[PDB]
Structure 1
């Protein structure tokens, strides 16, 4: 179950990697990509220069959680619900969020690097 955020969506569109097929190609498994409501609100707030990203994130295959907290700060929402539970993968490309997630333990980390996705703290990728 792979929690996506906004710059993962933008970098996947800028690299032309599909979401579900890129995750299946990276992990060689199945994936439920998940968009929280704060990530979706951040994509909607990013403007109409990102309408492509908005209607690529509104996809039927991408399931969506519903975060219950005031405001739309995706990095604190992702970090809180990932150190809560230790069952997710965080897919991101923020330098700051990548450093937070790779400092907390037991949370794998997917990121668009090159021309397909790379995965960091998962020890069974091959």
Structure 2
């Protein structure tokens, strides 16, 4: 279950990597991409220069969570609902969010680079 966020979707589109087939080709397993509605808030608030990212976030494969916290700070919502559970795999591209994640012990996180996703802290990647 792969949590998604905004710069990941934007970077994925500008690298032209598909979401679900990109995750399957990166990780060789069925991936369920999961968007928090608080991160869809940010991906709406980015404005009309990212309507491609919006209508690719609206996708029946990408099943979406529901948050419960005032405001739309998606990075804190991501790190909170990860370190409550440690069952998710975080997809991101933010440097500070990457540092928060690789500070907390032992979740995997992935990021687009070159022309495919790369996955950082997961053992059975091959």
Shorter-chain TM-score above 0.5:
yes
In 1, the alpha carbon distance for the partners of 2:97 and 2:108 equals: 12
Q: 2:57 aligns to what? A: 57
In the alignment, the residues of structure 1 paired with residue 2 and residue 26 of structure 2 have an alpha-carbon distance, to the nearest angstrom, of 12
1:3-28 deviations in Å (ceiling 9; x for gaps):
00000000000001111111111110
Distance 1:12 1:125 in 2: 20
What is the Cα-based RMSD across aligned positions, in Å?
A: 0.5
- Show the counterpart of 1:36: 36
Taking structure 2 as the reference length, the TM-score comes to 0.99
In structure 1, runs of 5+ residues without a counterpart are: none
Q: CA deviation at 1:60?
A: 1.0
Per-residue CA deviations over 1:27-82 (Å, capped at 9, x if unaligned) read 10001000001110001000001111100100111010001110000000000000
Q: Which residue of 2 aligns with 1:92?
A: 92
Q: How far, CA to CA, are the matches of 2:66 and 2:18 in structure 1?
A: 23
Kindly tell me the number of residue pairs found equivalent between the two proteins.
126
- TM superposition shift of 1:106: 1.4
**Which secondary structure does the structure 2 equivalent of 1:21 belong to?**
helix
> 2:38 and 2:49 mapped to 1: Cα distance?
19
